[PDB]
Nucleic acid binder design. Structure first.
Ligand SMILES: [K+]
Ligand SMILES: [K+]
Ligand SMILES: [K+]
Ligand SMILES: [K+]
Ligand SMILES: [Mg+2]
Ligand SMILES: [Mg+2]
Ligand SMILES: [Mg+2]
Ligand SMILES: [Mg+2]
Ligand SMILES: [Mg+2]
Length: 153
RNA sequence: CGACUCUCGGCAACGGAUAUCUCGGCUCUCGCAUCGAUGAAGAACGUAGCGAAAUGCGAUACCUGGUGUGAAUUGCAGAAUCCGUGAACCAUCGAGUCUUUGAACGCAAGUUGCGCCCGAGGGGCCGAGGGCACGCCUGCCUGGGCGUCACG
């Protein structure tokens, strides 16, 4: 499989991938943006804190109508942030896959950082909703593809 | 320096255009003349070692028989067959079978409902199997009426 980015150090890097994951694309894009050059161990602790409501995820685009918390005040002075648990758990699973792929290669888990993370839109799935005056409207999910490369340096 | 918005490029997405095809369609021309009470067209239900549909067939049920060809069928498995009266999800057709219906015909019908007759075969009982609609034609049998007569 070809990712959108080459490792540039293919021997010293590990990758993980997920297609058509049933999690909101807009929520996962912000989660992926919050850990762009993060070290692997700090990324895991950050995502567990998000799961535990101790650290918020900053919502910069796709942010209209998002509350303000003060847990996100650093690196987002307006309080716009949230705690997307499903999008955090899905990324955590990918981080554990790439981590074990690195262990097979023998790269040390320490000094590993996310050199590439990407969320792309999957094909949408169809459901239905009913409206007043006998009308039917779409009721759609927005799944995503997630790509992840860990690198030593 | 960063976020946001806009923009340019590279890669990845989304989507199914374009290109090349085509056991289909459309148009034209030719030949032939063959449905049914000997039950048609249509409808239903069944039928395979594994099938729902389509295709095929009818309790002989993806087939029996004859002829032809001549070694397959296959998705899986088991059987049969090979210098042979002999394989085939083969071709073809003269021999057969052909459930419930339907013009549909004992009477009906949102009913597998309600009758009558004959009868192999084992007085009566049990029978397998089969009959019993309407209109009409020729002939036939049994009849009706002083309608027209004849003789008693
Ligand atoms: K709000
Ligand atoms: K672009
Ligand atoms: K085309
Ligand atoms: K009745
Ligand atoms: Mg509101
Ligand atoms: Mg409603
Ligand atoms: Mg209504
Ligand atoms: Mg067939
Ligand atoms: Mg009838």
């Amino acid at each position: 499989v070809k990712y959108s980015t080459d490792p540039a150090n293919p021997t010293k890097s590990a990758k993980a991938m997920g297609r058509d994951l049933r999690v909101h694309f807009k929520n996962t894009r912000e989660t992926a943006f919050a850990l762009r050059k993060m070290s692997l161990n700090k990324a895991k602790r950050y995502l567990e804190d998000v799961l535990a409501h101790k650290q918020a995820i900053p919502f910069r685009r796709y942010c209209r109508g998002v509350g303000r918390t003060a847990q996100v005040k650093n690196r987002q002075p307006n309080g716009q942030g949230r705690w997307p648990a499903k999008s955090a758990k899905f990324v955590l699973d990918l981080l554990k896959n790439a981590e074990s792929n690195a262990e097979v290669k023998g790269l040390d888990v320490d000094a590993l950082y996310i050199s590439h993370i990407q969320v792309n839109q999957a094909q949408k799935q169809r459901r239905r909703t009913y409206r007043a005056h006998g009308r039917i409207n779409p009721y759609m999910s927005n799944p995503c593809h997630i790509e992840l490369i860990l690198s030593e340096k």
